[PDB]
Design a protein around this ligand. Sequence first.
Ligand SMILES: Cc1cc(C#N)cc(C)c1Oc1nc(Nc2ccc(C#N)cc2)nc(CO)c1Br
Ligand SMILES: [Mg+2]
Lengths: 552, 427
Amino acid sequence: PISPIETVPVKLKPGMDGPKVKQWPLTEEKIKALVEICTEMEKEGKISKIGPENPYNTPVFAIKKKDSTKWRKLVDFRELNKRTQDFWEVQLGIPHPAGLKKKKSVTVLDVGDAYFSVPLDEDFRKYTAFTIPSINNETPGIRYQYNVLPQGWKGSPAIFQSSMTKILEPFKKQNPDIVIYQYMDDLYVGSDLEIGQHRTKIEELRQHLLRWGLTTPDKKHQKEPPFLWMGYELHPDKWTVQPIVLPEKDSWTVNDIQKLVGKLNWASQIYPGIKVRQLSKLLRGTKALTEVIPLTEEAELELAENREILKEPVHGVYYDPSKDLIAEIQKQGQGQWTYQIYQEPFKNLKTGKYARMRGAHTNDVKQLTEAVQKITTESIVIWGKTPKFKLPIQKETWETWWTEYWQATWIPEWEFVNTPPLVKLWYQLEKEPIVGAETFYVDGAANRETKLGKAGYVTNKGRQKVVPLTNTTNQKTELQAIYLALQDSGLEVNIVTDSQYALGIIQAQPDKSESELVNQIIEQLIKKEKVYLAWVPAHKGIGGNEQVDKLV
Amino acid sequence: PISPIETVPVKLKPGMDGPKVKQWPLTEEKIKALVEICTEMEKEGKISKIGPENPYNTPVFAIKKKDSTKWRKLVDFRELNKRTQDFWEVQLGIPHPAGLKKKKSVTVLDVGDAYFSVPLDEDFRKYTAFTIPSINNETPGIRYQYNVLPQGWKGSPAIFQSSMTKILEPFKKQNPDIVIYQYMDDLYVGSDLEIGQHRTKIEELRQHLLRWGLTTPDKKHQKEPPFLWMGYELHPDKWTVQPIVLPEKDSWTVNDIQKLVGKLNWASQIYPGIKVRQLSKLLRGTKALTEVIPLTEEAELELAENREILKEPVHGVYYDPSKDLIAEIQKQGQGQWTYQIYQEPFKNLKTGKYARMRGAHTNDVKQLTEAVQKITTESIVIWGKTPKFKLPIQKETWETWWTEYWQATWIPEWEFVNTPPLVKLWY
Ligand SMILES: Cc1cc(C#N)cc(C)c1Oc1nc(Nc2ccc(C#N)cc2)nc(CO)c1Br
Ligand SMILES: [Mg+2]
């Protein structure tokens, strides 16, 4: 029940000092209950009657939930915790199955009885002092002081997993075949022995632990081959997700809409095409938890296109450090990209998606890059290496673009994989003006308050126009201006603008943006033979806005 | 009394609590390096294992020593620095000689090895703790913390400063014209001797340090020259102004003069005395673009005129030691990059250009990691302090690959910028 483990010396924050809160309501039936657990506790050395002298108290509560055959002691260390130094956080993350090695037999041990076995820094004890109120006659209550890690204390999970790891270390050495992993109240053991030999090692480990005062159990209500790990359905040579539940309903609300998406994503680790752009878009309403939201058309279709997918159970394989890691990416459309990492072209290792939630204007190639990146990170975290990539884009494309782009990117090793769609450059602005082409001097202001604007051009030819627009902005007009010139120009044109805005947006060659206007522009750009853009300062350059502005 | 010293009491700024920076995850290759490298330090007593009561944590990587046989443990004490050395930039500042930039040649040696003799104040250690990660979170990190002034923490130099000067002094004597600047892990020696002498004077120094405890690895090669370039040899008396070139053209076209008007147009707030109007007047017309057109009244006058106030640097361009230095970098393509190191907008303390080579061998994220270590060092020399880089790269990409070509023992401060506009044209 208690081990001869060295203790992690502990301290209370800088200036502070132990807590002095109390609680004194005595229900006989419980003061007994506690003094009960307490006597069987002290007996087991886990606590100690303390003589009135400097102690600091803490709340004592008695509990019995459902199926109560016994009671349960419970102290509230909230006020103590708020006074103890911080510790080294562990378990921030969980190993992800897609990178687990195929092991044969397995066994999860129960180590909850745990923290009550590890010692408490001899000196930090005085603070743990709690007091069970005895005679209501306001008599010197039977007072104790913890000797092992208290159930709620701050430094407990920490000082525990610590002590643990230290106890496994030796056993881990003389048994390099026996892989262990601990997570809180548990201690999972996986090996390549046959269920017999395996239940041997388990016994040794079991004994080993016990010598260290850490007592473990032999049976309880659990299960076998599948394993229920945090959300993963774990099988000996395959893993996959515990059956998910996409609920259908009448009125949906944010709280629900979120809980849906979240469930949806989780499935993505392995369900090939899971899509989510639409169902998420419906949460622009960054507010109401109960504000019922209409599953407006676009969403529904998606959700269902997902129901058909979960509809057919699929699982995954493990990591073979011997074989190669690969990654393929396929574009889906609305800025969504799917991928799956594997070693063998058939069943998967893990899959994933990448959506561009970065605003308004983007590019397929770029996105492709962003995807790749996302994955390389994950791969490093999971496998600790960098998959060879398989991507729907040809060097004469990629290379050309990283050659143009003002930012610097860097894709790792990649092999082209011809399969629709296909990342490419739907157009290219000409670098030098066009000899012979009509020069359109576009422009177009807007009234910031009246919201009334104009957009027009004037060509070298002396071909003019102005088109009335309402409910628009300096930006909207400025583009509409570039959309106009484009419209009214021939298969070749030299366009001149004043907005660094309009310009930039066109230069990146956005494959798309839902901003139909930009699109309208984008498409005209594709239909043209040759285009040339030019930027010239606003309030003091050319001499063409004015003659149209004076009109506006 | 431990053979080398007795701890120098360290105290971080009040209201300041130790670092708690997360550990980037790494490659298995890299973990194993560190795992070995640390089991060594561990043995040599250099470092120990820590418990759960050490909530502190500074990052670590593994880099290629000098494109060598084995690895190097590179700690990113960037946080612990801000939290300490800033008041050890005071309580123990290491004075920066404004003439070294003048020397004809500056060699850079790595003294990072001496520190490991000096034991770190018994109480500050807890802060220099770092953690080697694990793949797929299967195992709790490994936790080591220092016991000797560690390399990288801008506090070792300050502590060791004492003992340095002493070791140096009897060479700074026989050699009173040579300047020796200590900056963290490295020594920067300057001299106006013909190289051949210099190089020798350096090794003449290298052995002086050596026969006095300190060990400098800087032995790049021997008699056999596999076209491998000798030690770090900068030449700061050539650290002059970069070229902002307008083009003298055979023929001028609406477009050419169009753009030209732009460049000049914004140089406007670098030098508030540039006039375009005389040029901007020939474009007030809505003429074709391929069309060729000539001068205006004082056009030619204004071209060669502003061509001038341009070749003559600015004003109010003095260095503010109280402020921070800032380096902006922009891709030029085909291996070329450019940079400015200002403190406030358009008052550039300096600018330059970096260029690697041609295709087959280099990628962007190498040029940038080098253009960076280049600009850092010019900066260390000139102002005795590294700048904060406004990098034109996607945060995560950089975050992923910078180590991949990083050779410097120190790490600057950086942030990313998704927009470098009209600036590329200009420079
Ligand atoms: C992640 C995990 C979960 C459970 C739990 N629960 C038990 C153990 C021991 C575990 O560790 C590992 N598991 C596996 N594969 C594994 C395969 C199938 C099944 C089943 N059924 C369980 C584990 N491989 C590695 C190697 O790296 C580790 Br480490
Ligand atoms: Mg205008």
